[PDB]
């Protein structure tokens, strides 16, 4: 219920937002901004995409990073070959806004994934006006009517969707509401637990032509090549990042594993 609570500041978060910039102009925005960098086509290139993410805080870990400048973190993740840039928006338990994600945005020219907790349509519109080519569906959030719905949108605004789980019937619920990109989350939202296997348990029941990214929990190389052994196609990473003195180095690191 860590998860319950985060939704219950997230929507008033949203409608405070929406009450000074509106549904209409947010959705005017949103169709003016320069279309969606093809994610997918990002995701397929050679190697195991690394996903560097912008993340100040969180439930868990409580301050992890100041990030007073959050382009110039960006800047380091695409030095060290991050394939997509992750920004983490959520204000009161991750310190995140969306003035993270414009900086980020102007900053870099890879992909940019907007993590948040996506519950209504004013979000996808939202990430979209900011820069977003890519948004994070949470299955454990989402009703299954609420999913396929937010997906729907999101898709149809150009943007990919990351439709996180973190058990195998959220993955087969997933793939129901038309999934092509699956995250699995080695952390139990709910309970805030790290289970890496979660993933290798995963991914097999997925069709392969969904694309498979293990998020979470990501220490070093060790822990990339083990998701990768099970079949991830990409790793998100956030905490050994964001509090490293040399990110750029920490990222390259990552993107040569096994090499
Ligand atoms: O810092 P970590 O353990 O490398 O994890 C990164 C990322 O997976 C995590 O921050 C995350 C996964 N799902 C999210 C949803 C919202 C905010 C954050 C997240
Ligand atoms: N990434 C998260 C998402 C939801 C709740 C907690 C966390 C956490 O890392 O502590």
Redesign the pocket.
């Known amino acids: 219920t860590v998860l319950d609570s985060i939704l219950e500041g997230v929507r008033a978060d949203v409608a405070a937002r929406e009450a000074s910039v509106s549904l209409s102009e947010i959705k005017a925005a949103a169709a003016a901004a320069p279309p969606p960098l093809d994610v997918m086509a990002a995701l397929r290139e050679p190697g195991i995409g690394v996903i560097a ?1 912008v ?1 100040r805080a ?1 439930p868990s ?1 409580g301050a ?1 990073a100041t990030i007073a400048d959050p382009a110039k973190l960006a800047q380091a993740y695409q030095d060290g070959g991050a394939r997509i840039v ?1 920004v ?1 928006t ?1 204000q009161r338990r ?1 310190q995140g806004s969306l003035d993270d994600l414009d900086a980020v945005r102007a900053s870099v020219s890879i992909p940019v994934l907007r ?3 996506v519950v209504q349509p004013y979000q996808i519109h939202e990430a979209r006006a900011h820069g977003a080519d890519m948004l ?1 569906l ?1 299955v454990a959030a989402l009703e299954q009517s609420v999913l396929v719905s937010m997906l729907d949108r999101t898709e149809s605004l150009g943007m990919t969707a990351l439709v ?1 789980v973190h058990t195998e019937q959220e993955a087969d619920r997933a793939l129901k509401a038309g999934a092509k990109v699956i ?1 699995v ?3 139990d ?1 709910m309970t805030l637990d ?1 289970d890496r296997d979660c993933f290798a348990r995963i991914a097999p029941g997925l069709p392969s032509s969904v694309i498979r990214i293990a ?4 220490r070093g190389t060790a822990d990339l090549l083990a998701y990768a052994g099970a079949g991830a196609d990409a790793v ?7 509090t490293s003195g040399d990110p750029r180095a920490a990222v390259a690191d990552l993107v040569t594993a096994g090499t």
Do not use: M
């Open positions: 993410e993340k969180s870990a992890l992750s983490v959520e991750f993590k948040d907790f994070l949470i996180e995250g989350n080695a952390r939202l790290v998020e979470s929990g990501v998100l990473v956030g905490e050994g990042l964001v």
